[PDB]
């Protein structure tokens, strides 16, 4: 069944006024909270 | 989703503060992906 869920609305006009690219908010908001997978690394003979 | 929403996109804010929306530089409407093909059944609109 449907459940409550937080909704964040980025005010497009305000963002341009303060000179913040919308493509940066979508990353900080999406990477800080949702987690991001940047790249791989080699450890103990395996890639992680 | 709506064409109204697309027409509300913000391209850039003028130095005077006036907004330059997408609808101010482009006519938005729902159209076909490709207009190359145009079918006709007994001289009547159709598709298949």
PDB file of C-alpha atoms in Angstrom:
ATOM      1  CA  UNK A   1       0.000   0.000   0.000  1.00  0.00           C
ATOM      2  CA  UNK A   2       1.080   3.569  -0.668  1.00  0.00           C
ATOM      3  CA  UNK A   3       3.073   5.190   2.133  1.00  0.00           C
ATOM      4  CA  UNK A   4       4.271   8.710   2.969  1.00  0.00           C
ATOM      5  CA  UNK A   5       7.368   9.875   1.120  1.00  0.00           C
ATOM      6  CA  UNK A   6       9.433  13.046   1.372  1.00  0.00           C
ATOM      7  CA  UNK A   7       9.195  15.419  -1.596  1.00  0.00           C
ATOM      8  CA  UNK A   8      11.877  18.026  -2.335  1.00  0.00           C
ATOM      9  CA  UNK A   9      11.064  20.736  -4.887  1.00  0.00           C
ATOM     10  CA  UNK A  10      13.991  22.652  -6.375  1.00  0.00           C
ATOM     11  CA  UNK A  11      12.801  26.181  -7.144  1.00  0.00           C
ATOM     12  CA  UNK A  12      14.194  26.655 -10.646  1.00  0.00           C
ATOM     13  CA  UNK A  13      14.004  30.455 -10.611  1.00  0.00           C
ATOM     14  CA  UNK A  14      15.751  30.766  -7.241  1.00  0.00           C
ATOM     15  CA  UNK A  15      18.559  28.412  -8.271  1.00  0.00           C
ATOM     16  CA  UNK A  16      19.508  30.536 -11.286  1.00  0.00           C
ATOM     17  CA  UNK A  17      19.400  33.715  -9.191  1.00  0.00           C
ATOM     18  CA  UNK A  18      21.934  32.263  -6.739  1.00  0.00           C
ATOM     19  CA  UNK A  19      24.034  30.862  -9.597  1.00  0.00           C
ATOM     20  CA  UNK A  20      23.825  27.155  -8.714  1.00  0.00           C
ATOM     21  CA  UNK A  21      23.609  24.707 -11.606  1.00  0.00           C
ATOM     22  CA  UNK A  22      20.629  22.364 -11.352  1.00  0.00           C
ATOM     23  CA  UNK A  23      22.957  19.577 -12.493  1.00  0.00           C
ATOM     24  CA  UNK A  24      24.922  20.112  -9.258  1.00  0.00           C
ATOM     25  CA  UNK A  25      21.957  19.992  -6.868  1.00  0.00           C
ATOM     26  CA  UNK A  26      20.797  16.734  -8.456  1.00  0.00           C
ATOM     27  CA  UNK A  27      24.215  15.236  -7.637  1.00  0.00           C
ATOM     28  CA  UNK A  28      24.732  16.572  -4.110  1.00  0.00           C
ATOM     29  CA  UNK A  29      21.152  15.653  -3.219  1.00  0.00           C
ATOM     30  CA  UNK A  30      21.405  12.346  -5.087  1.00  0.00           C
ATOM     31  CA  UNK A  31      24.917  11.410  -3.953  1.00  0.00           C
ATOM     32  CA  UNK A  32      24.815  12.557  -0.325  1.00  0.00           C
ATOM     33  CA  UNK A  33      21.567  10.725   0.492  1.00  0.00           C
ATOM     34  CA  UNK A  34      21.228   7.959  -2.099  1.00  0.00           C
ATOM     35  CA  UNK A  35      24.898   7.027  -2.293  1.00  0.00           C
ATOM     36  CA  UNK A  36      26.945   6.926  -5.494  1.00  0.00           C
ATOM     37  CA  UNK A  37      29.301   4.440  -7.148  1.00  0.00           C
ATOM     38  CA  UNK A  38      32.307   6.370  -8.424  1.00  0.00           C
ATOM     39  CA  UNK A  39      34.710   3.732  -9.790  1.00  0.00           C
ATOM     40  CA  UNK A  40      36.556   0.491  -9.003  1.00  0.00           C
ATOM     41  CA  UNK A  41      39.821  -0.372  -7.284  1.00  0.00           C
ATOM     42  CA  UNK A  42      42.053  -3.433  -6.990  1.00  0.00           C
ATOM     43  CA  UNK A  43      42.516  -5.108  -3.608  1.00  0.00           C
ATOM     44  CA  UNK A  44      43.969  -8.507  -2.685  1.00  0.00           C
ATOM     45  CA  UNK A  45      43.862  -9.657  -6.292  1.00  0.00           C
ATOM     46  CA  UNK A  46      40.234  -8.651  -6.863  1.00  0.00           C
ATOM     47  CA  UNK A  47      38.330  -5.628  -8.157  1.00  0.00           C
ATOM     48  CA  UNK A  48      36.005  -3.899  -5.690  1.00  0.00           C
TER      49      UNK A  48
ATOM     50  CA  UNK B   1       4.466  15.507 -19.010  1.00  0.00           C
ATOM     51  CA  UNK B   2       2.213  18.416 -20.010  1.00  0.00           C
ATOM     52  CA  UNK B   3       3.129  20.742 -22.848  1.00  0.00           C
ATOM     53  CA  UNK B   4       2.334  23.504 -20.356  1.00  0.00           C
ATOM     54  CA  UNK B   5       5.080  22.218 -18.052  1.00  0.00           C
ATOM     55  CA  UNK B   6       7.604  22.173 -20.900  1.00  0.00           C
ATOM     56  CA  UNK B   7       6.596  25.710 -21.860  1.00  0.00           C
ATOM     57  CA  UNK B   8       7.456  26.758 -18.297  1.00  0.00           C
ATOM     58  CA  UNK B   9      11.104  25.675 -18.580  1.00  0.00           C
ATOM     59  CA  UNK B  10      13.518  28.451 -17.597  1.00  0.00           C
ATOM     60  CA  UNK B  11      16.266  29.116 -20.143  1.00  0.00           C
ATOM     61  CA  UNK B  12      17.882  32.209 -18.618  1.00  0.00           C
ATOM     62  CA  UNK B  13      16.785  35.189 -16.531  1.00  0.00           C
ATOM     63  CA  UNK B  14      17.269  38.583 -18.155  1.00  0.00           C
ATOM     64  CA  UNK B  15      19.403  41.188 -16.410  1.00  0.00           C
ATOM     65  CA  UNK B  16      16.236  43.192 -15.699  1.00  0.00           C
ATOM     66  CA  UNK B  17      14.751  40.150 -13.933  1.00  0.00           C
ATOM     67  CA  UNK B  18      12.305  39.163 -16.673  1.00  0.00           C
ATOM     68  CA  UNK B  19      12.206  35.417 -17.298  1.00  0.00           C
ATOM     69  CA  UNK B  20      12.911  33.807 -20.669  1.00  0.00           C
ATOM     70  CA  UNK B  21      10.805  30.652 -20.769  1.00  0.00           C
ATOM     71  CA  UNK B  22      11.040  28.014 -23.481  1.00  0.00           C
ATOM     72  CA  UNK B  23       7.606  28.962 -24.824  1.00  0.00           C
ATOM     73  CA  UNK B  24       9.020  32.427 -25.579  1.00  0.00           C
ATOM     74  CA  UNK B  25      11.492  31.043 -28.153  1.00  0.00           C
ATOM     75  CA  UNK B  26       9.724  27.906 -29.369  1.00  0.00           C
ATOM     76  CA  UNK B  27       6.227  26.660 -30.172  1.00  0.00           C
ATOM     77  CA  UNK B  28       5.634  23.418 -28.252  1.00  0.00           C
ATOM     78  CA  UNK B  29       3.161  20.772 -29.395  1.00  0.00           C
ATOM     79  CA  UNK B  30       2.745  17.006 -29.407  1.00  0.00           C
ATOM     80  CA  UNK B  31       3.850  15.702 -32.798  1.00  0.00           C
ATOM     81  CA  UNK B  32       5.029  12.503 -34.394  1.00  0.00           C
ATOM     82  CA  UNK B  33       8.564  11.216 -34.051  1.00  0.00           C
ATOM     83  CA  UNK B  34       8.981  11.116 -37.840  1.00  0.00           C
ATOM     84  CA  UNK B  35       6.778  12.757 -40.472  1.00  0.00           C
ATOM     85  CA  UNK B  36       8.267  10.735 -43.344  1.00  0.00           C
ATOM     86  CA  UNK B  37       5.390   8.224 -43.443  1.00  0.00           C
ATOM     87  CA  UNK B  38       1.781   9.344 -43.907  1.00  0.00           C
ATOM     88  CA  UNK B  39      -0.759   6.569 -44.440  1.00  0.00           C
ATOM     89  CA  UNK B  40      -4.207   6.971 -45.987  1.00  0.00           C
ATOM     90  CA  UNK B  41      -7.135   4.540 -46.232  1.00  0.00           C
ATOM     91  CA  UNK B  42      -9.598   5.208 -49.069  1.00  0.00           C
ATOM     92  CA  UNK B  43      -8.561   8.852 -49.007  1.00  0.00           C
ATOM     93  CA  UNK B  44      -9.132   9.016 -45.247  1.00  0.00           C
ATOM     94  CA  UNK B  45      -6.793   9.486 -42.271  1.00  0.00           C
ATOM     95  CA  UNK B  46      -5.489   6.155 -41.028  1.00  0.00           C
ATOM     96  CA  UNK B  47      -2.526   4.179 -39.724  1.00  0.00           C
ATOM     97  CA  UNK B  48      -1.552   0.542 -39.498  1.00  0.00           C
TER      98      UNK B  48
END
